[PDB]
Design a protein around this ligand. Structure first.
Ligand SMILES: [Mg+2]
Ligand SMILES: [Mg+2]
Ligand SMILES: [Mg+2]
Ligand SMILES: [Mg+2]
Ligand SMILES: [Mg+2]
Ligand SMILES: [Mg+2]
Ligand SMILES: [Mg+2]
Ligand SMILES: [Mg+2]
Ligand SMILES: [Mg+2]
Ligand SMILES: [Mg+2]
Ligand SMILES: [Mg+2]
Length: 74
RNA sequence: AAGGGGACCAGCCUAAACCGUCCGGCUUGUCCGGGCGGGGUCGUGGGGCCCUCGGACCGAAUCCCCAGCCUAGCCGAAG
């Protein structure tokens, strides 16, 4: 069963990552303890949009600076 | 059971894509979800979206009126 981790988890996987666990594990431990969520299409979308939105504001800072290399350094 | 002969005869509405709107969530949006509206409905496959061209008739199973019908009656020949 595919779930998306909400946290780093000892020898399972890393936050945001999509892993495969026994339905029991997911339903009766992972999900109830907030540690993960079903890899539904609908919240697979969302994880993708977060990966997307983080990657925007990061490469957008690696540009706000690189541009400030141009004001100084000259 | 098909098929043949008959009775009757009638076909429609959606879900999804996509577009819009309100509402809610927290893991802030190019987000996810729920309501509503638009769109769409099919087997020669149909639809959506994007180009090109083209730009009145049909019509209810709903509603309204009416004929007709029912719920009392009445006239009715000649010892
Ligand atoms: Mg048979
Ligand atoms: Mg027959
Ligand atoms: Mg027949
Ligand atoms: Mg008959
Ligand atoms: Mg939705
Ligand atoms: Mg929406
Ligand atoms: Mg909606
Ligand atoms: Mg087609
Ligand atoms: Mg109808
Ligand atoms: Mg009499
Ligand atoms: Mg008499």
């Amino acid at each position: 069963m595919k779930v998306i981790l909400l946290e780093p988890l000892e020898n399972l996987g890393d936050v945001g990552q999509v892993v495969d666990v026994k339905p029991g594990y997911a339903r009766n431990y992972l999900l109830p303890r907030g540690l993960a969520v079903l890899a539904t299409e609908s919240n697979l979308k969302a994880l993708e949009a977060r990966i997307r939105a983080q990657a925007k504001r990061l490469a957008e800072r690696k540009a706000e600076a690189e541009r400030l290399k141009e004001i100084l350094e000259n």
